[PDB]
Design a protein around this ligand. Structure first.
Ligand SMILES: CSC[S@](=O)C[C@H](CO)NC(=O)/C=C/c1c(C)[nH]c(=O)[nH]c1=O
Ligand SMILES: [Cl-]
Ligand SMILES: [Cl-]
Ligand SMILES: [Cl-]
Ligand SMILES: [Cl-]
Ligand SMILES: [Cl-]
Ligand SMILES: [Cl-]
Ligand SMILES: [K+]
Ligand SMILES: [Mg+2]
Ligand SMILES: [Mg+2]
Ligand SMILES: [Mg+2]
Ligand SMILES: [Mg+2]
Ligand SMILES: [Mg+2]
Ligand SMILES: [Mg+2]
Ligand SMILES: [Mg+2]
Ligand SMILES: [Mg+2]
Ligand SMILES: [Mg+2]
Ligand SMILES: [Mg+2]
Ligand SMILES: [Mg+2]
Ligand SMILES: [Mg+2]
Ligand SMILES: [Mg+2]
Ligand SMILES: [Mg+2]
Ligand SMILES: [Mg+2]
Ligand SMILES: [Mg+2]
Ligand SMILES: [Mg+2]
Ligand SMILES: [Mg+2]
Ligand SMILES: [Mg+2]
Ligand SMILES: [Mg+2]
Ligand SMILES: [Mg+2]
Ligand SMILES: [Mg+2]
Ligand SMILES: [Mg+2]
Ligand SMILES: [Mg+2]
Ligand SMILES: [Mg+2]
Ligand SMILES: [Mg+2]
Ligand code: NA
Ligand code: NA
Ligand code: NA
Ligand code: NA
Ligand code: NA
Ligand code: NA
Ligand code: NA
Ligand code: NA
Ligand code: NA
Ligand code: NA
Ligand code: NA
Ligand code: NA
Ligand code: NA
Ligand code: NA
Ligand code: NA
Ligand code: NA
Ligand code: NA
Ligand code: NA
Ligand code: NA
Ligand code: NA
Ligand SMILES: [Sr+2]
Ligand SMILES: [Sr+2]
Ligand SMILES: [Sr+2]
Ligand SMILES: [Sr+2]
Ligand SMILES: [Sr+2]
Ligand SMILES: [Sr+2]
Ligand SMILES: [Sr+2]
Ligand SMILES: [Sr+2]
Ligand SMILES: [Sr+2]
Ligand SMILES: [Sr+2]
Ligand SMILES: [Sr+2]
Ligand SMILES: [Sr+2]
Ligand SMILES: [Sr+2]
Ligand SMILES: [Sr+2]
Ligand SMILES: [Sr+2]
Ligand SMILES: [Sr+2]
Ligand SMILES: [Sr+2]
Ligand SMILES: [Sr+2]
Ligand SMILES: [Sr+2]
Ligand SMILES: [Sr+2]
Ligand SMILES: [Sr+2]
Ligand SMILES: [Sr+2]
Ligand SMILES: [Sr+2]
Ligand SMILES: [Sr+2]
Ligand SMILES: [Sr+2]
Ligand SMILES: [Sr+2]
Ligand SMILES: [Sr+2]
Lengths: 160, 92, 95, 186, 154
RNA sequence: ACAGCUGGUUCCAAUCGAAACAUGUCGAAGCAUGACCUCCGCCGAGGUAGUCUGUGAGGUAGAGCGACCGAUUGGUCCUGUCAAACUCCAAACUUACAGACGCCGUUUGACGCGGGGAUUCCGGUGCGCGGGGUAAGCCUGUGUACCAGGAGGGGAACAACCCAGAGAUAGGUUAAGGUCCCCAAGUGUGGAUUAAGUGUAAUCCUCUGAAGGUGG
RNA sequence: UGAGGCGCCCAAAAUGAUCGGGACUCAAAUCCACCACCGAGACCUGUCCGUACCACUCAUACUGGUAAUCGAGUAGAUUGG
RNA sequence: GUUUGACUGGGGCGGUACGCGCUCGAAAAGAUAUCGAGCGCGCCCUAUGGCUAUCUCAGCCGGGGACCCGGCGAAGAGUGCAAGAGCAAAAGAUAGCUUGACAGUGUUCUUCCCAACGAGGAACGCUGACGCGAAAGCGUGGUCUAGCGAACCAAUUAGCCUGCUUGAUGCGGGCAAUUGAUGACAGAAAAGCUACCCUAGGGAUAACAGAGUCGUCACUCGCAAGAGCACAUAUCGACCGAGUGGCUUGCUACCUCGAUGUCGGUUCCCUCCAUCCUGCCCGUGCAGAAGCGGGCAAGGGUGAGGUUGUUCGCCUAUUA
RNA sequence: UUAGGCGGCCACAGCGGUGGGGUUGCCUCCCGUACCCAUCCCGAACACGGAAGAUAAGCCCACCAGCGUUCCGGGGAGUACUGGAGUGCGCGAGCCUCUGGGAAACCCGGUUCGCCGCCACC
């Protein structure tokens, strides 16, 4: 199913589990990556991926981007590299699909998505001044798998 | 539900509270001589008989209480609104 | 609405702010108003009886007499004049 | 106390001094209240009326100012309570009060108690108060008889500061006699 | 005291906004009214803000417009110093202009029609699709801006 | 014959001017009663479409939840997220009553009341707020202005986009929009960018142009 | 190395291509300001008509006066010809 | 001889949004729709009603999942049943007593916002008679909002009016009210077929087609995990993301019902390019020959046959 | 108000903590069950009768801010949101400008350890 179907915020917030059943499980395997035992303050560089437009990102997209990003960080820094990345959003919005014409059209539950306002940080990484470019590459690969354009913003990092 | 056979309440005849006995209203027999009875015979003939060709309606899932309240001292009874009760059993 | 009883859609207007929760002070339930007085109508969630139809919450009527302990307040619903039977517990002097 | 949503009772409720439910029922009469209180040593009667910023006492009497008319006996007994009610009642009539409702606050409606004695006294003073005779102690007890006979079972004077040996209900009579009289400075 | 001129027609304007103009005695495009600066009148002009041009005019400007467009409550009697002097509590237009600007009286109060039926702006105005700060003619104006408009509509 | 269904119903003008909604209905292609239009009569001094101020009503936007509630991360307090059927908070704003100013009414009698006559109960579009639906020149609400029943000017044409509400006739100045020619008005001024004929397209079923990329 | 402006690539449809057309490139494009004009039945102004109200009147016959606050209209109501 | 209802993204089937109550939808007064989301009511209860007295609950901790003692504990308990709301010296618990779940008659509001409409309901009175309490006071059923039914007829309750010249008796007619049902719930007594069909109309409502949409379908692009012996990119290429078309299908009901004749084929003409061949190119896991992939390009060509009405497709021999 | 009673507002009053206060005065704790009354068992409580003792509780007086609460300054913030207007921008979801309004969280510094009414009283 095309994201064009759900990327916009054109419907009420639909998140109440107490009144919604059959909600598919999320495809996001991890929200905290890298060395999650170490603090974020223990790093000289902090870079986030910022969304430029308000949108809805389905869990299948969060997983693909996160995966295609952490994967790179793993390939370039190792299965234990001194870094840590965080996917700070969770897919709370439940999505339907009307899958009989327009009669009794309320759709059946088909998935979940996270609402992201423009300007917000979807992902945030913490690395050493060495791997600062490997993370910028991980994000480049991440924003290629989500709807909106993104800014790779470098927070703590005056080593340029 | 349950209900007391006798209890104190207002008797609209004595105009004061007194013991009463509650009884379910028993149907009295018809005489077959009321005006409606004669109209059924005057207006029924050959073919359909209008209202006299209709047959008994249905039933409500629950009926309302149909009771008589007799004053224990003057012997007169009075009626009251009834309330839907699936079952009415008197105590004693 | 899905139903049309008297308390339809009254979740907010008939609910107490948590701190006003609990039996209300007797003073305002015994207050006396004179004919001609302007009184605001507002049901007190904690007081069961002596209420008017929730739809009239927020009206500022005129006491034009009483019935028993309750008051008869005159209001103008839209363009229709109506008389409301309401106890002091749900009334407040204006100004 | 715990947080924002926490509900603290009305002050007089947490102090455990005012039964608001009874209060409301009392105020519904539209009449003044004959507020009967009592301490370990004393008894107080007040005729309270409703007011804009709080109640308003129009008249009242304390067991202390009872002596002011010839009383050398204790002030926490039946004779004491009755006379106090009568004194408060009399003053009530003075200020123009003609009827009331007994407000025993948080005391118990025990038959023949002092709050009921205060009531009988206030009623004899001419005040119109809804009551029930078979809940009022019998005349003699009000006088102080019960305590006289108690002193009868002597061995050691009932009272410490010798007010008298075999005590006195007859004194109660002298004082009641002095109050029912016209003269008296209320 | 602010001068108010309707620059946008009634078609499609909210009814409560149109009734507001009418309460301010303006019933046509290009019609001008003089309103005192009070809290009550303030709410009114702020409400019609997008269909009008207003501001405080200079004494001279008010004098020019009064001379050229003021009218009696009834009749076609021209209004000039002689008229003013013989019908109002003033000696000439200037005395009137001053009293109006200082809010001591109103046109109606002095037997004059509450409205100044102005002429289309000679050379045109700055447009009715944008406010003054954006180069348009709508909304509040400087005394110089307001005078420029009123003089063009003399 | 009957039909709640289609068609038609013939002269001129002047005043006012809708409803396409609510309740009931074997009712949904119909009626009745209301709302609303109009006419007549009664009444006799106030009225309230705007705003300001005072006294009240309200929990939507937003926000937040170590304030309830239910969701929703990880680590050895901290750290990551949410709510149409959550709220410790909380607007703009809508709304009752009153006073003030404004406007209006007391020969144009307002407000209110009684009675005669209706038409109407297929609506539509824009904008704001929506709910359903991938969406639709979709379906179904709500507030408002418009079309319907609204000319004239502009928009190539074009019910509802812009200006504009219009007796006749005449002179003048503007509005929207435009000023190289077609076609009335500039081949206007100061300055800058663009080399793609990008563009010369307010709005839109109507005018596309995206993620991504660019030592132009 | 960061930011902004315009443009370029991404970019495929059926009878004849298009910004209405011609055609336009220090513009007749775009953006920032500015100057002068054209252009409605709007607004201003002369005269007349209708309608409403006013004065005079038997008059709804004349005469005079007022209208910034009157002048579009489907169904329908009312009235003169 | 008649009936066989209405609603409905056409109708039928399915369902009942056909009478009621709650939350949300609903946009902070009120009102507000859909075959909108969550879900309930057609009862049950003589106490599970009423009053009074005495009393304080979930849950946790400490001392001897039953009991006893103490501490914390504004309410998370309980209150018949949906939901939302109310309630703590109580509206909850226990105990005792009691029958107000009473008779008569109104005011007002609701039903039906505004704004007319019945039954039903509620709040608040006056009158009568009672219960409990010291008394104020409380009790017109259950804390509040669902638990409901016209006229005609019958039975029933108490008193009274009346029946053709008149009296008596029988048997009738009536004033007031209770109970018996119409759930299509503001009330008809009621099954289907028609391809033998007929009429009135409707593009107010469907079929083909047009138009809008583009989920579906076709095609493309971005990213490039993966494999391709080594090698992302000779070649194949998941996920996810972004688009174009209007060839498939679906959706809508805008046009047409006083008619725009279906599919397939045939014949004849024009066109599109996302190119199968032919021309010219680039790469190769390109020796050659040949393959495979890609680019420009619509001048021309793209044929004959077997089954099947087929479109499609399968099959045969030819063919650049 | 050198200690009391009846209250209004109903946490600015709550939670917690410190210090001070009482010979025939006040409130209490306190002492005691013949009576009125009382405990499904207990004079615990309720009720009655009373002063040997006490200021340790309570209570009243003075005060502290750690938690909770009210209001206020400065910052967040004229931000978020928004009524009116636009031939302003954007492929579009949407954004911007002008006009009139205008939060919440949170941080820091203050305020708040009740205010007020009637009666009585060295
Ligand atoms: C002018 S109308 C042409 S028809 O509608 C042509 C179309 C072609 O798809 N045919 C149909 O729809 C046929 C439908 C049929 C149905 C519903 N049932 C049948 O038993 N037979 C049919 O042919
Ligand atoms: Cl029965
Ligand atoms: Cl009401
Ligand atoms: Cl006491
Ligand atoms: Cl008009
Ligand atoms: Cl060209
Ligand atoms: Cl004529
Ligand atoms: K047709
Ligand atoms: Mg709400
Ligand atoms: Mg004039
Ligand atoms: Mg312009
Ligand atoms: Mg005509
Ligand atoms: Mg005429
Ligand atoms: Mg929100
Ligand atoms: Mg029409
Ligand atoms: Mg011009
Ligand atoms: Mg020319
Ligand atoms: Mg082009
Ligand atoms: Mg027949
Ligand atoms: Mg049908
Ligand atoms: Mg509402
Ligand atoms: Mg029948
Ligand atoms: Mg019966
Ligand atoms: Mg019905
Ligand atoms: Mg109904
Ligand atoms: Mg036919
Ligand atoms: Mg049509
Ligand atoms: Mg159609
Ligand atoms: Mg033909
Ligand atoms: Mg090609
Ligand atoms: Mg080769
Ligand atoms: Mg060709
Ligand atoms: Mg001490
Ligand atoms: Mg646009
Ligand atoms: Na016969
Ligand atoms: Na309360
Ligand atoms: Na017929
Ligand atoms: Na019909
Ligand atoms: Na309609
Ligand atoms: Na209908
Ligand atoms: Na006025
Ligand atoms: Na918003
Ligand atoms: Na119009
Ligand atoms: Na034209
Ligand atoms: Na071009
Ligand atoms: Na007409
Ligand atoms: Na039927
Ligand atoms: Na169906
Ligand atoms: Na009724
Ligand atoms: Na289609
Ligand atoms: Na497309
Ligand atoms: Na070719
Ligand atoms: Na074949
Ligand atoms: Na002490
Ligand atoms: Sr939507
Ligand atoms: Sr992207
Ligand atoms: Sr016969
Ligand atoms: Sr027969
Ligand atoms: Sr049945
Ligand atoms: Sr008109
Ligand atoms: Sr609203
Ligand atoms: Sr030029
Ligand atoms: Sr230039
Ligand atoms: Sr079209
Ligand atoms: Sr566009
Ligand atoms: Sr792009
Ligand atoms: Sr005309
Ligand atoms: Sr006309
Ligand atoms: Sr048949
Ligand atoms: Sr169908
Ligand atoms: Sr009740
Ligand atoms: Sr059958
Ligand atoms: Sr056949
Ligand atoms: Sr035709
Ligand atoms: Sr091509
Ligand atoms: Sr080839
Ligand atoms: Sr075909
Ligand atoms: Sr086939
Ligand atoms: Sr003891
Ligand atoms: Sr697009
Ligand atoms: Sr401000």
């Amino acid at each position: 199913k095309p994201a064009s179907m759900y990327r916009d915020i054109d419907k009420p917030a639909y998140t109440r589990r107490e009144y919604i059943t059959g909600i598919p499980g999320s495809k996001i395997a991890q929200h905290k990556m890298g060395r999650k035992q170490k603090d974020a303050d223990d790093y000289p560089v902090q870079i986030s991926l910022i969304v430029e437009e308000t949108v809805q990102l389905r869990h299948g997209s969060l997983e693909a981007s996160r995966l295609s990003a952490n994967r790179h960080l793993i390939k370039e820094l190792g299965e234990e590299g001194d870094y840590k990345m965080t996917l700070r959003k969770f897919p709370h919005q439940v999505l339907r699909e009307n899958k009989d014409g327009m009669r009794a059209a309320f759709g059946k539950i088909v998935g979940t998505a996270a609402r992201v306002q423009a300007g917000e940080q979807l992902f945030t990484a913490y690395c050493n001044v060495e791997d600062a470019e490997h993370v910028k590459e991980a994000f480049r690969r991440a924003y290629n798998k989500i709807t909106p354009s993104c800014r790779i913003d470098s927070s703590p990092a005056g080593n340029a | 539900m349950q209900m007391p056979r006798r209890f104190n309440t207002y008797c609209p005849h004595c105009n004061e509270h007194q013991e009463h006995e509650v009884e379910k209203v028993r149907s009295g027999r018809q005489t077959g001589m009321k005006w409606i009875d004669r109209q059924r015979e005057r207006n029924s003939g050959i073919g359909n008989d209008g209202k006299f060709s209709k047959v008994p309606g249905g039933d409500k899932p629950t009926k309302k209480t149909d009771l008589k309240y007799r004053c224990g001292e003057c012997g007169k009874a009075h009626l009251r609104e009834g309330w839907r009760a699936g079952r009415l059993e008197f105590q004693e | 609405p899905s139903s049309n009883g008297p308390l339809e859609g009254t979740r907010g207007k008939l609910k107490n702010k948590p701190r006003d929760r609990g039996t209300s002070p007797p003073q305002r339930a015994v207050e006396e108003f004179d004919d001609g007085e302007k009184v605001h109508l507002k049901i007190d969630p904690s007081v069961p009886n002596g209420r008017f139809h929730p739809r009239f919450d927020g009206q500022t009527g005129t006491v034009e007499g009483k019935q028993g302990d309750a008051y008869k307040v005159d209001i103008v619903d839209g363009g229709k004049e109506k008389t409301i039977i309401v106890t002091a517990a749900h009334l407040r002097r204006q100004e | 106390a715990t947080g924002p949503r926490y509900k603290v009772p009305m002050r007089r409720r947490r102090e455990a001094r005012t039964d608001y439910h009874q209060r409301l029922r009392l105020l519904k009469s539209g009449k003044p209240r004959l507020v009967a209180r009592k301490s370990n040593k004393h008894v107080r009667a007040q005729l309270v009326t409703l007011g804009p910023n709080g109640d308003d006492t129009l008249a009242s009497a304390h067991s202390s100012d009872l002596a002011e008319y010839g009383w050398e006996a204790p002030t926490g007994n039946m004779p004491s309570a009755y006379l106090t009610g009568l004194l408060a009642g009399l003053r009530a009539q003075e200020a123009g009060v003609e009827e009331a409702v007994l407000d025993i606050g948080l005391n118990s409606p025990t038959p023949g108690s002092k709050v009921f004695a205060i009531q009988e006294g206030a009623i004899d003073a001419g005040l119109d108060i809804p009551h029930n005779d078979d809940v009022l102690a019998d005349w003699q007890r009000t006088r102080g008889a019960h305590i006289a006979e108690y002193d009868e079972q002597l061995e050691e004077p009932l009272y410490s500061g010798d007010f008298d040996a075999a005590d006195l209900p007859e004194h109660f009579d002298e004082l009641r006699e002095t109050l029912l009289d016209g003269d008296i400075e209320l | 005291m602010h001068a108010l001129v309707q620059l946008r027609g009634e078609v499609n304007m909210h009814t409560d906004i149109q009734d507001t103009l009418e309460m301010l005695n303006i019933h046509h495009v290009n019609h001008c009214t003089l309103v005192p600066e009070t809290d009550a009148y303030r709410g009114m002009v702020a409400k019609v803000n997008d269909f009008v041009a207003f501001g405080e005019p200079s004494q001279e400007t008010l004098e020019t417009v009064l001379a050229t467009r003021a009218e009696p409550l009834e009749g076609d009697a021209d209004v000039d110093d002689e008229w003013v002097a013989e019908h109002t509590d003033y000696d000439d237009i200037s005395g009137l202009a001053f009293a109006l600007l200082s809010e001591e009286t109103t046109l109606r109060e002095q037997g004059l029609s509450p409205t100044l039926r102005l002429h289309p702006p000679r050379g045109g105005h700055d447009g009715v699709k944008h406010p003054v700060k954006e180069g348009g003619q709508l909304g509040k104006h400087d005394t110089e801006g307001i005078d420029d408009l009123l003089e063009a509509m003399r």
